């Protein structure tokens, strides 16, 4: 007749804890709704004695938790925490070797796009805004990247195993980074129509899709004009700590000392594999846990990152 109970804590951010007394004869789901223990779904499980004192994630189901979840993650997508937990149940089992001084990811679960994204982040100046990403990225740099990788999957609405694109993944991460001071001025010149200047800010100031070469972007790239002519677009002014140049995969030569790092994609629109190339004392190719070196590199490159501070054109 005596209900037997244990004390547990619920949370949405793993920092602020909420004391609960749970009935050991009812499932966690009957008492909390969807409930997770370090990523594992315990909604249909009844409390174990070993659960006493442990922390469980729940969905934001009252106003206090709604505020805590938004302040930590900067999202109000109702499915976010469930997707973060579902990914974490996988990423906590991945291995994160140090390769040439950087945290990589041993290949598992079709994660090569995440490995090259993680390697790239550690080579560019970037600060995240959500505390969740600040905290997880700090841990990832130290070598414990499971929470960071699960957050990337959640913020990008990708599940473990799903085909991912590096450019799109970086776009999501940059949306949650402080790029407010970044600025880009472009000029587009048509022999018929004249010239038109455009200013871009934030994420749009550091990403370009169409050519891999920063030098070519400075000299001019050809794009369509609405009048039918081919116009020339070139970079007038750049203020940012890096730039990212992207293009559909094509054979491309990477020259030591002319770029920071790059992503290589081998395959087709439905199926493929990413590798990472970093330019240090030589060219290192990081493929998850694997490492090779070369003095020259040619391959199907999709994204190239360059160092920057301030650039102003000499084109009149």
| Interface residue list for a copy of itself (CB under 8 A) | 33, 59-61, 63, 66-67, 70, 75-79, 157, 162-165, 167-168, 175, 180, 199-202, 209-210, 246, 248, 250, 268-270
In angstroms, rounded to a whole number, what is the distance separating the alpha carbons of residues 143 and 150? Answer: 14
**Residue 112: enclosing H or E segment and its boundaries?**
helix 112-121
Candidates 17, 142, 163, 193; binder of Zn ion (CB under 5 A) is 193
Length of the chain: 316
Candidates 19, 49, 192, 314; binder of Zn ion (CB under 5 A) is 192
Q: Which is nearer to Zn ion, 192 or 314 (CB)?
A: 192
Residue identified by tokens 């140090």 is: 98
Coil/strand/helix, residue 241: coil
Closest separation between CB of residue 250 and a copy of itself, Å? 7
192's contact among a copy of itself, Zn ion, none, with CB below 5 to 8 A by partner kind, is Zn ion
Q: Which is nearer to a copy of itself, 5 or 211 (CB)?
A: 211
Instruction: Convert 36-79 into a string of H (helix), E (strand) and C (coil).
Output: EECCEECCCCCCCHHHCCCEEEECCCCHHHHHHHHHHHCCCCCC
Q: Which stretch binds Zn ion (CB under 5 A): 22-30, 55-63, 149-157, 221-229?
A: 221-229
Closest separation between CB of residue 304 and Zn ion, Å? 29
229's contact among a copy of itself, Zn ion, none, with CB below 5 to 8 A by partner kind, is Zn ion
Instruction: Kindly state whether residue 229 participates in binding Zn ion, applying the rule CB under 5 A.
Output: yes
Instruction: Kindly state whether residue 194 participates in binding Zn ion, applying the rule CB under 5 A.
Output: no
Closest separation between CB of residue 40 and a copy of itself, Å? 20
Q: Which residues neighbour 60 within 8 Å (Cβ) at sequence distance 6 or greater?
A: 12, 66, 68, 69, 81
User: CA 213, 216, 220, 225 torsion: positive or negative?
Assistant: negative
Closest separation between CB of residue 199 and a copy of itself, Å? 8
309's contact among Zn ion, a copy of itself, none, with CB below 5 to 8 A by partner kind, is none
In angstroms, rounded to a whole number, what is the distance separating the alpha carbons of residues 42 and 22? Answer: 13
**Residue 30: enclosing H or E segment and its boundaries?**
helix 28-32
Residues that bind Zn ion (CB under 5 A): 190, 192-193, 225, 227, 229
């Amino acid at each position: 007749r005596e209900v037997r109970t244990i004390k547990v804590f619920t949370t949405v951010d793993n920092i602020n804890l909420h004391t609960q007394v749970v009935d050991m004869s009812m499932t966690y789901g009957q008492q909390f709704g969807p409930t997770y223990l370090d990523g594992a779904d315990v909604t249909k499980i009844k409390p174990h004695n070993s659960h006493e004192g442990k922390t469980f994630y729940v969905l934001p189901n009252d106003d206090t938790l709604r505020v805590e979840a938004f302040e930590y993650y900067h999202t109000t997508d109702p499915s976010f925490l469930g997707r973060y937990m579902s990914a974490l149940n996988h990423t906590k089992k991945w291995k994160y070797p140090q390769v040439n001084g950087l945290t990589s990811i041993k290949w598992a679960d079709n994660n090569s796009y995440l490995a090259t994204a993680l390697l790239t982040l550690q080579q560019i100046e970037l600060k995240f805004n959500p505390p969740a990403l600040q905290d997880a990225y700090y841990r990832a740099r130290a070598g414990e990247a499971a929470n960071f990788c699960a957050l990337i999957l959640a913020y990008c609405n990708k599940t473990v195993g799903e085909l991912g694109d590096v450019r799109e993944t970086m776009s999501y991460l940059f949306q949650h980074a402080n790029l407010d001071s970044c600025k880009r001025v472009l000029n587009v010149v048509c022999k018929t129509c004249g010239q038109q200047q455009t200013t871009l800010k934030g994420v749009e100031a550091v990403m370009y899709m169409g050519t891999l070469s920063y030098e070519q972007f400075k000299k001019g790239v050809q794009i369509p004009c609405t009048c039918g002519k081919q116009a020339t677009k070139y970079l007038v002014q750049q203020e940012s700590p890096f730039v990212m140049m992207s293009a559909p995969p094509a054979q491309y030569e990477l020259k030591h000392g002319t770029f920071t790092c790059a992503s290589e994609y081998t395959g087709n629109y439905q199926c493929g594999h990413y590798k990472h190339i970093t330019s240090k004392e030589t060219l290192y190719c990081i493929d998850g846990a694997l490492l090779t070196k070369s003095s020259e590199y040619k391959g199907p490159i999709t994204d190239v990152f360059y160092k920057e501070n301030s650039y102003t054109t000499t084109i009149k």
